[PDB]
Amino acid sequence: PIDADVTVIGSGPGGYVAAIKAAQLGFKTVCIEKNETLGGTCLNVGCIPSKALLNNSHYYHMAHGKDFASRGIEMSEVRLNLDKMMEQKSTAVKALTGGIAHLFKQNKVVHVNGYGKITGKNQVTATKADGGTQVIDTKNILIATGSEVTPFPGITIDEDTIVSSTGALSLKKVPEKMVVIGAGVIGVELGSVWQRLGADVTAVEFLGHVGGVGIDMEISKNFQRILQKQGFKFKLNTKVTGATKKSDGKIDVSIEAASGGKAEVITCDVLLVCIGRRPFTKNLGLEELGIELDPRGRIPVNTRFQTKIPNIYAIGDVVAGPMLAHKAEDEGIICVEGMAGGAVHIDYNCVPSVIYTHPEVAWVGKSEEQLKEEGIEYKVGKFPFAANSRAKTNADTDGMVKILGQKSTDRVLGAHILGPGAGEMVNEAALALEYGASCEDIARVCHAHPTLSEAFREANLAASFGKSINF
Amino acid sequence: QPIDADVTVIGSGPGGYVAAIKAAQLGFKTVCIEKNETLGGTCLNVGCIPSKALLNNSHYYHMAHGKDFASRGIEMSEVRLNLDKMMEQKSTAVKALTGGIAHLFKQNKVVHVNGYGKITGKNQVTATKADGGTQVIDTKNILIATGSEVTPFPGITIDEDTIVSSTGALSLKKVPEKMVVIGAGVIGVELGSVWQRLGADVTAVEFLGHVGGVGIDMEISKNFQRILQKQGFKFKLNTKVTGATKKSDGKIDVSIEAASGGKAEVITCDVLLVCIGRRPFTKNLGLEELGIELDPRGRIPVNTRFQTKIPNIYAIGDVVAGPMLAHKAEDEGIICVEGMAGGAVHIDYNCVPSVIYTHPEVAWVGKSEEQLKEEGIEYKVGKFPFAANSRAKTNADTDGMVKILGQKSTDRVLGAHILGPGAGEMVNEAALALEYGASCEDIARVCHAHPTLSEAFREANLAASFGKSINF
Ligand SMILES: Cc1cc2nc3c(=O)[nH]c(=O)nc-3n(C[C@H](O)[C@H](O)[C@H](O)COP(=O)(O)OP(=O)(O)OC[C@H]3O[C@@H](n4cnc5c(N)ncnc54)[C@H](O)[C@@H]3O)c2cc1C
Numbered sequence: 009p010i011d012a013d014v015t016v017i018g019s020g021p022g023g024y025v026a027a028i029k030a031a032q033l034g035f036k037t038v039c040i041e042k043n044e045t046l047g048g049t050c051l052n053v054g055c056i057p058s059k060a061l062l063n064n065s066h067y068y069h070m071a072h073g074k075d076f077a078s079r080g081i082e083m084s085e086v087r088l089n090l091d092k093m094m095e096q097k098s099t100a101v102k103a104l105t106g107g108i109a110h111l112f113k114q115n116k117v118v119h120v121n122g123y124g125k126i127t128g129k130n131q132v133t134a135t136k137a138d139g140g141t142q143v144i145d146t147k148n149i150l151i152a153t154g155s156e157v158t159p160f161p162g163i164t165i166d167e168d169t170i171v172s173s174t175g176a177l178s179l180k181k182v183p184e185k186m187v188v189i190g191a192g193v194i195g196v197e198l199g200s201v202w203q204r205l206g207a208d209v210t211a212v213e214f215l216g217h218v219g220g221v222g223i224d225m226e227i228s229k230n231f232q233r234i235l236q237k238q239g240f241k242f243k244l245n246t247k248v249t250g251a252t253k254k255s256d257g258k259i260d261v262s263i264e265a266a267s268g269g270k271a272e273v274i275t276c277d278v279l280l281v282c283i284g285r286r287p288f289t290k291n292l293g294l295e296e297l298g299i300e301l302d303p304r305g306r307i308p309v310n311t312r313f314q315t316k317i318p319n320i321y322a323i324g325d326v327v328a329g330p331m332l333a334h335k336a337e338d339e340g341i342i343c344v345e346g347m348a349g350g351a352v353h354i355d356y357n358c359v360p361s362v363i364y365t366h367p368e369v370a371w372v373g374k375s376e377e378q379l380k381e382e383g384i385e386y387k388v389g390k391f392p393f394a395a396n397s398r399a400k401t402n403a404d405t406d407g408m409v410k411i412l413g414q415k416s417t418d419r420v421l422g423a424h425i426l427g428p429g430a431g432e433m434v435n436e437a438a439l440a441l442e443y444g445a446s447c448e449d450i451a452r453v454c455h456a457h458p459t460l461s462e463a464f465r466e467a468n469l470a471a472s473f474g475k476s477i478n479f
Numbered sequence: 480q481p482i483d484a485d486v487t488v489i490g491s492g493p494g495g496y497v498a499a500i501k502a503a504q505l506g507f508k509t510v511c512i513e514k515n516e517t518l519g520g521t522c523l524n525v526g527c528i529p530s531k532a533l534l535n536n537s538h539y540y541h542m543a544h545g546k547d548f549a550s551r552g553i554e555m556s557e558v559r560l561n562l563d564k565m566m567e568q569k570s571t572a573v574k575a576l577t578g579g580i581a582h583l584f585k586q587n588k589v590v591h592v593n594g595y596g597k598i599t600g601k602n603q604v605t606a607t608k609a610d611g612g613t614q615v616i617d618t619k620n621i622l623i624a625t626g627s628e629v630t631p632f633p634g635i636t637i638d639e640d641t642i643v644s645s646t647g648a649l650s651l652k653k654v655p656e657k658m659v660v661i662g663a664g665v666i667g668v669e670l671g672s673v674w675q676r677l678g679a680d681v682t683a684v685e686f687l688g689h690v691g692g693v694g695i696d697m698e699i700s701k702n703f704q705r706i707l708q709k710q711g712f713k714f715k716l717n718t719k720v721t722g723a724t725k726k727s728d729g730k731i732d733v734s735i736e737a738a739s740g741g742k743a744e745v746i747t748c749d750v751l752l753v754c755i756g757r758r759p760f761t762k763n764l765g766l767e768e769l770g771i772e773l774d775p776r777g778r779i780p781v782n783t784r785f786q787t788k789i790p791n792i793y794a795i796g797d798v799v800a801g802p803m804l805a806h807k808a809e810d811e812g813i814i815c816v817e818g819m820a821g822g823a824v825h826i827d828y829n830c831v832p833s834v835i836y837t838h839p840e841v842a843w844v845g846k847s848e849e850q851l852k853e854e855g856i857e858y859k860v861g862k863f864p865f866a867a868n869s870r871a872k873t874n875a876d877t878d879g880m881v882k883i884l885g886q887k888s889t890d891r892v893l894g895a896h897i898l899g900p901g902a903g904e905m906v907n908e909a910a911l912a913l914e915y916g917a918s919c920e921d922i923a924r925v926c927h928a929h930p931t932l933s934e935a936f937r938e939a940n941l942a943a944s945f946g947k948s949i950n951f
Pocket residue numbers: 017018019020021022023040041042043047048049050051053054055056058122123124125152153154155156173194288290291292323324325326331332333334335336929930
């Protein structure tokens with residue numbers, strides 16, 4: 009029987025960071041993880057392996073395609089060694105998951121391997137695989153149990169030929185033809201990986217836009233345009249009625265228009281299902297505690313991330329807000345800081361989103377659609393990467409930066425980046441929004457030349473002064 | 480016949496052309512004078528743009544020709560360098576961007592005058608064309624943006640064949656087997672790295688004891704040198720060049736000594752690149768008749784409004800004090816012109832970043848540890864290595880670190896130093912933080928997207944403020 013001040017259930021970005029932070033704050037901290045490794049979804053089957061394949065497949069596309077030839081880099085034959093590519097991804101995951109174990113040891117966090125159940129208001133019971141149980145008597149419980157793939161009814165995932173994101177990250181061979189259910193962030197990234205590697209990729213989406221929820225519509229349409237020129241095909245406003253395996257091993261996917269009619273069937277070697285991810289709370293003990301989930305399966309919490317039970321907290325994918333790794337990390341920190349008497353506030357408006365395709369997509373703050381719905385009057389500033397010096401020097405000119413500013417105060421309300429380096433660039437925008445910078449304020453910052461970030465500067469100038477220098 | 484203007488800009492580099500565009504946008508009637516055949520000055524034509532083009536392309540060549548692509552499962556039977564085609568890509572970018580300036584001048588109603596400009600009167604500039612024809616401008620204000628030129632090495636004459644300046648090095652016809660670079664500054668290191676990647680055997684000779692030029696943090700410089708040496712870049716620091724001689728075979732013998740004395744030796748090369756610095760260009764501008772005298776280094780003295788001794792004659796960019804960088808020249812051009820219209824004029828050179836576009840990149844803004852010690856400012860240090868950053872590790876691109884210097888009592892960020900991937904873009908987040916007096920804690924509380932290289936910048940600030948980072 010272990011006693012601790014804070015017991016964290018889950019070792020994903022929210023849990024493992026929260027556990028480290030609590031230990032650094034003087035709490036006696038225990039972290040419970042059922043899986044064989046730490047790091048949760050993001051490290052093991054999420055951010056890390058997908059970004060590795062996006063990076064590796066992009067370079068393959070550059071070598072196999074015309075890009076390197078245009079720069080005087082001539083290759084007689086370019087062939088794909090998928091095993092070695094997957095090996096590079098695996099090397100990264102193992103290095104990072106091992107790093108978490110090193111960090112837990114460094115900060116005196118106690119790692120418990122088992123399935124954690126809340127058996128008492130102050131106790132958690134961890135059941136090991138052999139059946140052995142470890143009991144933790146604890147002042148505070150931090151729930152960071154995360155998410156799972158949302159199943160598609162009538163379509164059964166076998167991680168062989170009908171795959172979730174996990175299976176798509178480890179295909180043993182490039183499928184000749186692949187269908188993706190869901191054109192959200194995960195679907196678009198994974199389809200693009202396999203599309204670059206030679207697969208014929210179609211993504212089927214019930215909604216009318218690509219990129220998931222909260223993405224600016226102009227950005228979404230331009231993003232789709234570029235992806236379509238790459239060879240990514242889209243069926244939007246389209247419903248999937250069912251999928252059936254066949255004797256030949258191919259899969260027939262039956263679809264219909266979302267409004268109705270237009271029945272059709274399409275075939276593939278691999279079907280990837282990414283209609284979403286949902287909060288995971290099974291066999292946690294919430295049933296007995298009287299903690300009621302919201303209709304979407306998330307745990308309700310107050311501003312301090314407290315459940316109705318004051319000493320039981322929840323953070324990350326399991327609660328409301330964007331289901332992102334950096335969001336879960338910050339919630340874990342402020343929640344644990346709140347346990348130490350700190351004030352707790354987060355504005356999900358300042359949580360950025362990134363799509364690691366090429367071109368990348370990144371945004372923070374509000375979209376034009378959000379501003380119109382909230383009745384806020386704004387002005388628009390745009391700068392295309394075709395006019396950016398570094399993008400032109402790199403011969404990589406897709407996309408633009410779009411800035412939304414408050415009409416009178418010039419305050420930056422949203423930043424949307426479609427093009428090279430969007431993922432890193434959005435962090436400059438994030439720093440600006442957190443402290444309420446104006447468009448003029450960013451325009452007056454001396455940005456290094458030549459850098460992609462100058463497109464961000466000039467877009468802010470356009471929103472503020474009405475005109476850019478280089479466009 | 481003679482032209483009248485509110486603003487006459489001499490020079491079309493980043494300082495001049497941006498200032499001319501801004502002056503027109505403020506309602507001034509603007510004329511821009513350029514002696515060269517194309518607009519854009521040093522940066523576009525023989526500076527930032529072509530060097531960044533070759534750095535980008537030679538870096539990709541290195542990844543394909545070397546082991547990087549193989550480690551990712553991108554297998555190629557043979558990788559060959561088509562130098563002519565690579566130089567073609569560089570030339571195409573320069574052509575598109577210099578032409579783009581012409582469109583912007585046309586878009587903003589700036590009058591483009593092609594000729595050599597001399598200040599013939601307090602309110603008059605005379606442009607002398609190659610044919611000998613002159614066009615005269617009577618103007619209320621004169622903005623000098625005449626830029627810089629290569630600093631020559633006395634006794635070693637550049638012919639842009641085997642003894643080259645940065646200009647010659649950017650257009651070599653073949654990869655030299657052996658190359659010597661005089662000067663380990665930003666330009667020397669970038670160009671030496673390009674040819675080293677393309678197969679040349681490269682040595683850089685530097686009179687000073689560190690690489691990367693002045694203002695670079697010494698710890699960053701030493702780590703940068705260490706990494707470049709593992710790439711194959713060779714350095715001889717604290718080393719003086721006594722002379723260089725061409726040889727009958729066409730090779731070059733470079734005679735060197737330790738700066739303190741002794742260790743005399745000779746090293747031979749196919750190409751010698753002379754990169755000891757750049758200096759202000761004011762030739763035949765008419766300053767002496769106006770009584771405008773240069774400082775010892777050849778720069779035009781100006782006040783905080785960029786005014787010369789003659790209040791209606793201004794100077795900006797490489798010809799004046801401050802870092803000789805393009806974004807510096809652009810900002811000075813905008814605020815100077817804004818000042819002509821009665822606007823406030825202020826720039827903080829401490830908030831001007833510097834970037835080295837090698838791989839890994841080097842970028843910094845604010846103060847170095849050496850500067851803080853010299854100024855007597857007490858600081859605390861926070862560091863985070865890219866080996867611990869998720870995106871860098873995912874990319875298998877893990878060299879370097881982020882170093883943050885914070886004031887001990889106020890927690891104010893005094894300097895940000897980045898050695899590693901994406902440093903050039905990242906420093907712009909740092910510049911935004913310094914310009915508005917952010918603290919280390921302030922940056923640490925910003926939600927940075929995961930996984931990004933910028934998370935290293937957040938964690939380094941957390942380390943400086945709180946004493947510890949999350950992931951290291
Ligand atoms: C393919 C893919 C790519 C992604 N890419 C990105 C990206 O680029 N950027 C981004 O921000 N997000 C990305 N995400 C999302 C990101 O992974 C999640 O938002 C994040 O992992 C959520 O963190 P969490 O700690 O809340 O949950 P999780 O990471 O799911 O952690 C939950 C952990 O708790 C454990 N656990 C659960 N219940 C129990 C229990 N009862 N007892 C014991 N242990 C338990 C689980 O085994 C798991 O290890 C991606 C997701 C996927 C699938």
